[PDB]
Amino acid sequence: TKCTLKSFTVEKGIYQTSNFRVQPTESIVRFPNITNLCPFGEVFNATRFASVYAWNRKRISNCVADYSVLYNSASFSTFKCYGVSPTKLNDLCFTNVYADSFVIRGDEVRQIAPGQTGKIADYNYKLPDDFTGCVIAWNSNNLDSKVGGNYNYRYRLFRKSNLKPFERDISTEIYQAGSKPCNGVEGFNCYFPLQSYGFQPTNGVGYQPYRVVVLSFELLHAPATVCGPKKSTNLVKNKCVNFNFNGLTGTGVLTESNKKFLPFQQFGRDIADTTDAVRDPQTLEILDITPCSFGGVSVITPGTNTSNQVAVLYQGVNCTEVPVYSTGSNVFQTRAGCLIGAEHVNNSYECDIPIGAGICASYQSI
Amino acid sequence: GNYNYRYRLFRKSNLKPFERDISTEIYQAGSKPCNGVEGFNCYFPLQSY
Amino acid sequence: QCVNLRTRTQLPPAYTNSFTRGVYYPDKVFRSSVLHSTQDLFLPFFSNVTWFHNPVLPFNDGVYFASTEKSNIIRGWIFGTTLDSKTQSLLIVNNATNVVIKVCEFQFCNDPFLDVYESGVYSSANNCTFEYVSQPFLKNLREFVFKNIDGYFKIYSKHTPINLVRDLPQGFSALEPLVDLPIGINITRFQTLLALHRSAAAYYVGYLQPRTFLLKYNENGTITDAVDCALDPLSE
Ligand SMILES: *[C@@H]1O[C@H](CO)[C@@H](O[C@@H]2O[C@H](CO)[C@@H](O)[C@H](O)[C@H]2NC(C)=O)[C@H](O)[C@H]1NC(C)=O
Ligand SMILES: *[C@@H]1O[C@H](CO)[C@@H](O[C@@H]2O[C@H](CO)[C@@H](O)[C@H](O)[C@H]2NC(C)=O)[C@H](O)[C@H]1NC(C)=O
Ligand SMILES: *[C@@H]1O[C@H](CO)[C@@H](O[C@@H]2O[C@H](CO)[C@@H](O)[C@H](O)[C@H]2NC(C)=O)[C@H](O)[C@H]1NC(C)=O
Ligand SMILES: *[C@@H]1O[C@H](CO)[C@@H](O[C@@H]2O[C@H](CO)[C@@H](O)[C@H](O)[C@H]2NC(C)=O)[C@H](O)[C@H]1NC(C)=O
Ligand SMILES: *[C@@H]1O[C@H](CO)[C@@H](O[C@@H]2O[C@H](CO)[C@@H](O)[C@H](O)[C@H]2NC(C)=O)[C@H](O)[C@H]1NC(C)=O
Ligand SMILES: *[C@@H]1O[C@H](CO)[C@@H](O[C@@H]2O[C@H](CO)[C@@H](O)[C@H](O)[C@H]2NC(C)=O)[C@H](O)[C@H]1NC(C)=O
Ligand SMILES: *[C@@H]1O[C@H](CO)[C@@H](O)[C@H](O)[C@H]1NC(C)=O
Ligand SMILES: *[C@@H]1O[C@H](CO)[C@@H](O)[C@H](O)[C@H]1NC(C)=O
Ligand SMILES: *[C@@H]1O[C@H](CO)[C@@H](O)[C@H](O)[C@H]1NC(C)=O
Ligand SMILES: *[C@@H]1O[C@H](CO)[C@@H](O)[C@H](O)[C@H]1NC(C)=O
Numbered sequence: 053t054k055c056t057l058k059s060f061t062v063e064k065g066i067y068q069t070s071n072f073r074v075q076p077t078e079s080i081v082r083f084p085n086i087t088n089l090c091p092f093g094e095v096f097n098a099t100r101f102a103s104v105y106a107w108n109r110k111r112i113s114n115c116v117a118d119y120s121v122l123y124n125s126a127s128f129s130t131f132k133c134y135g136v137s138p139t140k141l142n143d144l145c146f147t148n149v150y151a152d153s154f155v156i157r158g159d160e161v162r163q164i165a166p167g168q169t170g171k172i173a174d175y176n177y178k179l180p181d182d183f184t185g186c187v188i189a190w191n192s193n194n195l196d197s198k199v200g201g202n203y204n205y206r207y208r209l210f211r212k213s214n215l216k217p218f219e220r221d222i223s224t225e226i227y228q229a230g231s232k233p234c235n236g237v238e239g240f241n242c243y244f245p246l247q248s249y250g251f252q253p254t255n256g257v258g259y260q261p262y263r264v265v266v267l268s269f270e271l272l273h274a275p276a277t278v279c280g281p282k283k284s285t286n287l288v289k290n291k292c293v294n295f296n297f298n299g300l301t302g303t304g305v306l307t308e309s310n311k312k313f314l315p316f317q318q319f320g321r322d323i324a325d326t327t328d329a330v331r332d333p334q335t336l337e338i339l340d341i342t343p344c345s346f347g348g349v350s351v352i353t354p355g356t357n358t359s360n361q362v363a364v365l366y367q368g369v370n371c372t373e374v375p376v377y378s379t380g381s382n383v384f385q386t387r388a389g390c391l392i393g394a395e396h397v398n399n400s401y402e403c404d405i406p407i408g409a410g411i412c413a414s415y416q417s418i
Numbered sequence: 419g420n421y422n423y424r425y426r427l428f429r430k431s432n433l434k435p436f437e438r439d440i441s442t443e444i445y446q447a448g449s450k451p452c453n454g455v456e457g458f459n460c461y462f463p464l465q466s467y
Numbered sequence: 468q469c470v471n472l473r474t475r476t477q478l479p480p481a482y483t484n485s486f487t488r489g490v491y492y493p494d495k496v497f498r499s500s501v502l503h504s505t506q507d508l509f510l511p512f513f514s515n516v517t518w519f520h521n522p523v524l525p526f527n528d529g530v531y532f533a534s535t536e537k538s539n540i541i542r543g544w545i546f547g548t549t550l551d552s553k554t555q556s557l558l559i560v561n562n563a564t565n566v567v568i569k570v571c572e573f574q575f576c577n578d579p580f581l582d583v584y585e586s587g588v589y590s591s592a593n594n595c596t597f598e599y600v601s602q603p604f605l606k607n608l609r610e611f612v613f614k615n616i617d618g619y620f621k622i623y624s625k626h627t628p629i630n631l632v633r634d635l636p637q638g639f640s641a642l643e644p645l646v647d648l649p650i651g652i653n654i655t656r657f658q659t660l661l662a663l664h665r666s667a668a669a670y671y672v673g674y675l676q677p678r679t680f681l682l683k684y685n686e687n688g689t690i691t692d693a694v695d696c697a698l699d700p701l702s703e
Contacts (some may be wrong), residue, residue, distance in 0.1 A: 123448065316492075
């Protein structure tokens, strides 16, 4: 009171000092059951991968993809990422994903990178210097390499120019290194641009077959529909908490409600555009939201010059949630709120310090 | 090429203004604990130029 | 397997009165016993709606489609701008078991028709992007509203049992939302699909315009009455 009045003495009366509100206890968040997972098992558990110059391309859109398990997979030799951090990509998401799968040599694993050159990097698959996404590489010597020679795999060795970003070259034209033309038959200056891979089970690290899949993320103006599930939690009732019901955020106390939502609404507002009811996305039931209690506090004093003790009134607050004056003295509940520090008397006198609803207080104690 | 200059690559949180960090410790990028030993999802936070 | 017919399908393009049909729930918010004013695309009251007894038609901002259907002869819809494989096209079919939605660059024929003895009105189907299958859509009145806003295709539907003979009956019936699709296309024309067996159908088409309406919600949240704020001075 003295601080609010900015004085060291207080006259008799009732003053309004500060406010009061209940604080949130914990937080909750709800989301639908989460289904329609992006097809990724058939990509990384596929039987065979195509050639490096004929890399398989897969388009991913309109699903939910959990990349945390891929990042936590212990069977992957190399898991690199360029555009974003591998840990936090599960939250942010773009509109579509492109997967390029192929098989290269052990020493050619670092050819597939921005700002890199090589036979694969310039003839089979070239990444733009501004590429965003990730690359997953793993040895497959026990599977792809053949004891009789895995010559089914083929790699491009010759081309007049390099490869454009995300461009596939499958041209089988006879490369003419020299100026002597050839009528489709390789000669001194004519050669086949594609050569079979000579993978063997016993060839050493660096020449063993390595399966590599490159994931690229694109953010066309169409709405983004592919990224990780949003983990939900349980719910509580009869507690002023803050909630995030399917992206609708607010603070209040949640109770059971008897309103009858029609089967396509999700939340309701009464008037002046204030939400009152929500539907939990999992259990599909109607809840009720109430703002948890608040109100002003006032001090009743007989005057600093007279005495030194005071009483406190919380305005429009039920006498159940009061919290140093948590117990104090006898506590009275009145139509105007709750009062602490004064005793109720059966007599009746002239009104000294008005309080409200037909009652007031005076000093004798208060 | 000059490699006497290095910059931080990994950090647990965001730096406060006018703050200095010089500790060189392995990063537990993944769920697997590195336990002070480099391995999968464990990289040196300093990157050269 | 698509060929043009011999005779012309000279469907008479008649006109009739809209009355007070074509009201749909604008959002998914529940309100009880309240009057709410909203501005959006609607079919104006007492408008002049076209009646067909399969020409290429424009799309404009939105489309209101009505069918005085008997025994479920209408089957689907086609959407697009160039209607060829050089641009994206949308296809919706409702056969006996389910409804199929495709977003591909087809090569339709000059007079598509379903045929009965699946889909053969298109010569090619390439670069397919979106596929969808769901429950079947359909003396009955079938009302549909088609909208396309910021890459979202909105489809609202309603079915009504009627006993009147020819024109749209007087009354009020709101339309619930049915389907939302997050596909970005700039559709400007559309078409009707009929299972024409080799051996003459009436439907009504109207357009939507931006305006403000006043809607009444009863205790249960059902829209039972509406007022057009631009019809006459009393309504204003
Ligand atoms: C490819 O298949 C293997 C075999 O099932 C998958 O590995 C399993 O992953 C689950 C998920 O953590 C584990 O509980 C199993 O113990 C694993 N089994 C084996 C034999 O490894 C692997 O996850 C699949 N890969 C993809 C991308 O789906
Ligand atoms: C979301 O998934 C949960 C987990 O299965 C579903 O909860 C079960 O629903 C069945 C359906 O009758 C009940 O028999 C079970 O008792 C529920 N288990 C619980 C509540 O722990 C829930 O129904 C799903 N919600 C959907 C599909 O909307
Ligand atoms: C403050 O809250 C309590 C808790 O509900 C109220 O006590 C209720 O009083 C009515 C009328 O006497 C009883 O029918 C209820 O059973 C009581 N509730 C409980 C949980 O027992 C109290 O009335 C509230 N204060 C005021 C001024 O209304
Ligand atoms: C109605 O259309 C649906 C959708 O095309 C048909 O169901 C599919 O038919 C194809 C072609 O035989 C199958 O490959 C799919 O497996 C079917 N899917 C389902 C969910 O059944 C259906 O057969 C058609 N029915 C009629 C009577 O035309
Ligand atoms: C075939 O489909 C692809 C992929 O949907 C189309 O490629 C897109 O083309 C548009 C046109 O400028 C670009 O803006 C996109 O970035 C491309 N990639 C996407 C959407 O992933 C291609 O245009 C289609 N071909 C035809 C003839 O329509
Ligand atoms: C609005 O909802 C109420 C309550 O659900 C409906 O009142 C019930 O109507 C059914 C059939 O119309 C009766 O069998 C019930 O007995 C009614 N409830 C009670 C408590 O009597 C009401 O019909 C709904 N529609 C309107 C326009 O009010
Ligand atoms: C008010 O204060 C004065 C001294 O400042 C004192 O003499 C007087 O008695 C006080 N009045 C009371 C206590 O009623
Ligand atoms: C008098 O006051 C007491 C408490 O102060 C109360 O319990 C009682 O009901 C009142 N009236 C009487 C005793 O008639
Ligand atoms: C509808 O338009 C036609 C011509 O397009 C006209 O003959 C008819 O009177 C109109 N009906 C109205 C305005 O109710
Ligand atoms: C449709 O074409 C217009 C140009 O006429 C273009 O501005 C618009 O972006 C196109 N729609 C989409 C979804 O790209």
